[PDB]
Design a protein around this nucleic acid. Structure first.
Lengths: 163, 197, 166, 98, 116, 83, 76, 161
RNA sequence: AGAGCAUAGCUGUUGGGACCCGAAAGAUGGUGAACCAUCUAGUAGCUGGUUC
RNA sequence: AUUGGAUAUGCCAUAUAAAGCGCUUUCGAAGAGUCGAGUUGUGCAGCUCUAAAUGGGUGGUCAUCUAA
RNA sequence: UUGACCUCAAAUCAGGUAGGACUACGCGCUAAGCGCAGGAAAAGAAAAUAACCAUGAUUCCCUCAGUAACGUGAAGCGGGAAAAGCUCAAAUUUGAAAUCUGGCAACAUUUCUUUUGUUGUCCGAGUUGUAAUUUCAA
């Protein structure tokens, strides 16, 4: 058949170098594991039991409903969509929603790579909303690359029927 | 444009939600009686009758036949002229369909019938309008599609005890007690100008 | 979040996105058995509003019925006999073509402790809920027998009630 | 005394009350979020084959034919009027950016 | 088929015992809940007063019984019914007031954790 | 209600052209009122209707013959009947 | 008026693969989609872990949970 | 008649005869203790309620009652405050007092503070005072849990006791 | 310047299997290569009978 | 001897918690091959088409409900 | 060359469950046939009536009423029995998946050495969404 433009736009993913750079920044903001989080809580629990303030965390945002609500909140600075969601309808609107709400987005390879970042088997989509001040330049540099290598590229190919 | 091969008269026949087998068969018989009736689908709205002109304009009909079955118990028939025109609301009772055994007539489809009207219609100006509207509608205009040059039926309307008896003769079969309810000056709108009482 | 987007997309069914998916997915569904297990619902929004939770004990089964009883009613019954250790929760239309109508059936495992201990789905463990599809007790079973509230919707008639003092 | 009297009558004196509106009656009110979602999905999903036919008929100023198709397609003039008005808005919005 | 009424007095007795059983369980409190007084909905019966289902949310607000604690003391709440006239409001607000006048609610044990 | 002046004006405005042929107009409205006062009874109403129909048929047949309208249905010419 | 005419196609007797059309996302929305006020909870330390910390402390006090020092020294 | 029923007649095994047929048997009152100690096990619940001075129904009665002996405005119905009602019998008086006394025993609804709460409110108090709770709420360095001025007032009021 | 309402009895009559017995069928579901079980107390102007 | 729901009382109680009702210069999501329309068979089902957002359903512009 | 995920398989792997009978009463498909339940079932908290001074889930009884409607044959109201209300989907927990099955190890507990749990730990499920909060009466 002839793939519609909204479904063909997923075949033109993000390239080697930019994806590797994107995942390098994501891996500095991975969420905290279930095994580690318990250790952090029992450390704080033991501190309060013997005798007795912290800072807000900084981790990448995941979850389809959570991220879509972050795009519509104009909070997400970068949205990374898996290219192989089994029901494609789950993300078929995400590129158009990101275009409408002025968010930089990219379609990257494999849900597992996004899944690995957040200690899950699979992640449909990932969003970066806030980064540490030390890495504001790195996120800004990556977003520029996504604009140049994903949004500036293709562009016309996402409006043409695929296949 | 305005219209190609313009036939003088066309008829738009509708029914409301809440119609019955006796009522539908009556609607089918009248639609089959005349070839310039454009049978259409129900009107889901029983409130904004002003949209009826939109159906008439779209379907290129000038005569509107709307069936309103209130309480799905009594049949009210509105006859109106699509461009402005007077809207006349009628009552229908004593249903006889094509399956009844007193039926003995058989006419020809598309044959233009002869219009015979009661002389009491000329006694009152509102009865003149009702008689005038009926002849322009039942009377099949010349050049109508699926119309035959033969003549095989005559429609007889007699005003007995204030109620019109519409009988078609070769009895053709359509039987009902035609009773006037009221008259609206506009196309399904405007102030009421006549109450039959 | 995105479940609102999924449902408004489902409304447009002849749309370019949906028509291409309906044709493609109908092909893949026809290549399988008549009744086959689905890893996840193909319309996760419809399953979710009908009762599906992504937890152990809930099962999705896809079935195809010959187009032209209600097909949706027949989908529930045939899946009910196939997975007879499960209770049928609900069922929803997913796909169709010129020959087949495709339905997905939500079933729960009544013997699973995660279902046996959820007070929200506890109710289906009780034996009064064996074969709700076999008795017209599902959503499309209830509608089929005109069960509802209104004026649109037998022993009491024919009996002669003879009272003690009469 | 804590008992009820059943039958008889009560003071026919009347004093009307203006009751507020119930939250169930709020249904059918368009939301800002639902308007946004429906416009996004309208764009993404594309248009039905009969919606394309209607939009091209409107494009060539064949409005009478366009309404005849939509009314036969959907099934009512009321649905046809809304579909024509929605697709006409789409045509104007697309014509702005096309 | 004939429905024969030979169990008319055996039903009568069974219903009395169900009342007796219901009391035995909650004997200090009435065997039936209280009901509002409502006017039947027609031109034929609107001059009668009959028992309703439950009290409206305007009636409970005016009396002083929040819709949560209303059911716990045997006051039914009908959310569907409303008060189109002040007569129905004041007739049933007074009914709740009289019922609360005769009410003896027995205190319950409340958890009192040792710490703060 | 019953605005006679308005109703008469509407009737005249929407009046069909009398210049149309009798066969073309297909109207047999005469001047002598064939209306039985006892039309409540079935027999009197049927007789009055039959008399009006007979007069209408005779007038139409004479007009059809004058206007060369073959009102006689031909057996060879087969067409779908109304009933 | 109506003229009771018959349409040229009255019953009484094209780029199947068009390009994507941006009639809605051609312009960027400036403001958030929801006007719901921000809850205070997002500006405060989480009550989820505070609930979890307190019930971890209780098990530490009751000896159900081996403390980090006791568990670490037990590994040796 | 039935084969299952002939199965039992033709076998020497006894039936599972259970003797639980007690007619005129009324249910015995558990639930309350004051009601149990003043319940005539013969009389009906209507009679027992009426003798005890209670109401069996707060509504009407759908039949004639037993007669044994030949016995010889909006603002006013909304702001009125009925002052309870007298207790006709001694059982109702006994129920009334025990409920009042039981309230007195369990009358300390007020809560003490804890170590965390006391240091939280005290630290806010020393810096901001004991009257400006609005400015207390708007502080974030000390009011880490981000309590509003109404929860701070309850902490301050509760700390004294 | 109201005579009805209820209950019971007798009598008549209408519908229920309908005073008792007796009529060629057919249907649903089975058995054996027609039979069997329900429907069925099938259909009555008729036959025979109908008790001090 | 098995247990019901209560009562009295002891010991624990993760309350840095969880509620009800005051207020609002803040918000308020609501179920689609469904509803509906056309046509056949026995409201329901088949088949063709197929929606909306103060909308939709059902009654007399009003009332009343708020489906899938 | 390795690993992650996906999809499909195998096992006399571990733990379960289904069938058949009864069927007076229940609920379905099509008296009979067929399917499926329980101690009752079904129904059930209005996309319900009404046109009033309005009513208020369901079921049952009386009445409406042999009425309306088109010989068939109700229903609103009215009298009574019993009365009980709620759960989700759709809004980010986002200052923290707060959620859950299982294995193992302890402990407790029993209509019961037969039952049923608690705590700890490890894996798995789950961000394609498990909890809390919310259900328009808001």
């Amino acid at each position: 058949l002839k793939v519609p433009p909204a479904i063909a736009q997923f075949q033109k993913t993000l390239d080697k170098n930019t994806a590797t750079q994107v995942f390098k920044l994501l891996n500095k903001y991975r969420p905290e594991t279930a095994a580690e989080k318990k250790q952090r809580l029992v450390a704080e629990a033991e501190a309060v039991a013997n005798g007795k303030v912290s800072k807000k965390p900084y981790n990448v945002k995941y979850g389809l409903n959570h991220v879509v609500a972050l795009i519509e909140a104009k909070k997400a600075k970068l949205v990374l969509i898996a290219s192989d969601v089994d029901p494609i309808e789950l993300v078929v609107f995400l590129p158009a929603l990101c275009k409408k709400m002025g968010v930089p987005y990219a379609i990257v390879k494999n849900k597992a790579r996004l899944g690995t970042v957040i200690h899950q088997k699979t992640a449909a989509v990932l969003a970066v909303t806030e980064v540490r001040e030390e890495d504001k330049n790195e996120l800004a540099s990556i977003v520029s690359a996504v604009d140049a290598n994903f949004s500036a590229k293709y562009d016309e190919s996402r409006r043409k029927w695929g296949g | 444009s305005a219209g190609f091969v313009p036939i003088k008269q066309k008829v738009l026949v509708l029914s409301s939600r809440g119609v019955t087998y006796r009522q539908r068969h009556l609607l089918n018989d009248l639609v089959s009686m005349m070839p310039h009736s454009k049978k259409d689908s129900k009107l889901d709205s029983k409130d904004r009758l002003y949209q009826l002109n939109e159906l008439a304009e779209l379907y290129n009909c000038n005569n509107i036949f709307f069936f309103e079955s209130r309480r799905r118990e009594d049949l009210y028939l509105h006859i109106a002229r699509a461009p402005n025109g007077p809207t006349v609301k009628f009552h229908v009772e004593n249903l006889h369909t094509m399956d009844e055994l007193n039926m003995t007539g058989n006419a020809l489809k598309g044959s233009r019938p002869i219009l015979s009207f009661d002389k009491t219609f000329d006694t009152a100006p509102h009865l003149k309008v009702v008689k005038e509207l009926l002849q322009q509608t039942f009377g099949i205009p010349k050049g109508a599609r699926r119309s035959k040059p033969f003549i095989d039926r005559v429609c007889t309307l007699t005003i007995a005890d204030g109620k019109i008896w519409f009988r078609n003769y070769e009895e053709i079969g359509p039987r009902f007690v035609m009773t006037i309810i009221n008259i609206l000056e506009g196309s399904f709108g405007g102030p009421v100008i006549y109450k039959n009482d | 979040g995105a479940y609102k987007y999924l449902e408004e997309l489902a409304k447009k069914k002849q749309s370019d996105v949906n028509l291409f998916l309906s044709r493609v997915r109908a092909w893949e569904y026809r290549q399988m058995n008549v009744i086959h297990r689905a890893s996840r619902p193909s319309r996760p929004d419809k399953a979710r509003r009908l009762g599906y939770k992504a937890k152990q004990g809930y099962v999705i089964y896809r079935i195809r019925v010959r187009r032209g009883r209600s097909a949706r009613c027949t989908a529930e019954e045939r899946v009910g006999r196939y997975c007879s250790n499960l209770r049928v929760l609900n069922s929803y239309w997913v796909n169709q073509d010129a020959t087949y109508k495709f339905f997905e059936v939500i079933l729960v495992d009544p013997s699973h402790k995660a279902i046996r201990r959820d007070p929200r789905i506890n109710w289906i463990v009780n034996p009064v809920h064996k074969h709700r599809e076999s008795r017209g007790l599902t959503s499309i079973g209830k509608k089929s027998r005109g069960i509802g509230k209104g004026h649109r919707f037998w022993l009491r008639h024919n009996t002669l009630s003879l009272r003690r003092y009469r | 005394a804590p008992g009820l009297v059943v039958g008889l009558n009560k003071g026919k004196t009347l004093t009307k009350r203006q009751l507020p509106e119930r939250p169930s009656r709020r249904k059918g009110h368009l939301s800002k979020r639902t308007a946004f979602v429906r416009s996004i999905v309208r764009e993404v999903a594309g248009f039905a084959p009969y919606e394309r036919r209607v939009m091209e008929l409107i494009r060539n100023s064949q409005d009478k034919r366009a309404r005849k198709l939509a009314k036969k397609r959907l099934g009512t003039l009321k649905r046809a009027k809304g579909k024509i008005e929605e697709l006409t808005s789409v045509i104007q919005s697309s014509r702005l950016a096309h | 088929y004939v429905k024969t009424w030979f169990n008319q007095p055996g039903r009568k007795l069974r219903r009395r015992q169900a009342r007796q059983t219901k009391a035995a369980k909650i004997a200090p409190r009435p065997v039936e809940a209280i009901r509002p007084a409502v006017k039947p909905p027609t031109i034929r019966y609107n001059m009668k007063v009959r028992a309703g289902r439950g009290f409206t949310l305007e009636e409970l607000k005016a009396a002083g019984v929040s819709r949560r604690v209303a059911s716990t003391i045997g006051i039914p709440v009908d959310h569907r019914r409303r008060n189109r006239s002040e007569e129905s409001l004041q007739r049933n607000v007074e009914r709740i007031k009289v019922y609360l006048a005769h009410l003896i609610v027995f205190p319950r044990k409340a958890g009192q954790p040792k710490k703060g | 209600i019953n605005n006679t002046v308005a109703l008469e004006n509407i009737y005249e405005r929407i009046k069909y052209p009398d210049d149309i042929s009798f066969v073309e107009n297909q109207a047999v409205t005469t001047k002598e009122p064939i209306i039985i006062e006892n039309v409540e009874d079935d027999l009197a109403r049927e007789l009055a209707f039959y008399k009006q129909g007979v007069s209408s048929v005779k007038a139409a047949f004479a007009k059809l013959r004058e206007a060369n309208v073959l009102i006689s249905r031909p057996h060879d010419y087969f067409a779908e009947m109304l009933k | 008026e109506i003229d009771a005419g018959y349409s040229s196609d009255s019953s009484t007797e094209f780029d199947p693969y068009p390009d994507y059309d941006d009639f809605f996302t051609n312009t960027v929305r400036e403001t958030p989609l929801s006007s719901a006020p921000e809850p205070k909870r997002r500006f405060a330390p989480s009550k989820h872990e505070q609930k979890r910390i307190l019930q971890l402390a209780y098990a530490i006090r009751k000896g159900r949970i081996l403390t980090s020092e006791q568990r670490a020294e037990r590994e040796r | 008649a039935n084969p299952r029923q002939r199965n039992k007649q033709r076998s020497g095994k006894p039936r599972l005869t259970r003797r639980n047929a007690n007619k005129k048997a009324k249910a015995k009152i558990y639930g309350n203790f004051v009601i149990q100690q003043n319940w005539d096990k013969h009389a009906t619940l209507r009679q027992n309620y009426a003798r005890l001075g209670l109401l069996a129904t707060p509504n009407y009665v759908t039949g004639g009652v037993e007669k044994l002996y030949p016995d010889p405005t909006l603002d006013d119905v909304l702001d009125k405050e009925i002052s309870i009602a007298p207790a006709k019998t001694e059982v109702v008086r006994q129920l009334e007092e025990e409920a009042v006394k039981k309230a007195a025993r369990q009358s300390n609804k007020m809560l003490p503070l804890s170590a965390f709460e006391h240091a939280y409110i005290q630290r806010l108090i020393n810096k901001y005072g004991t009257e400006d709770f609005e400015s207390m709420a708007k502080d974030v360095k000390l009011n880490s849990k981000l309590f509003n001025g109404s929860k701070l007032k309850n902490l301050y009021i509760r700390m004294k006791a």
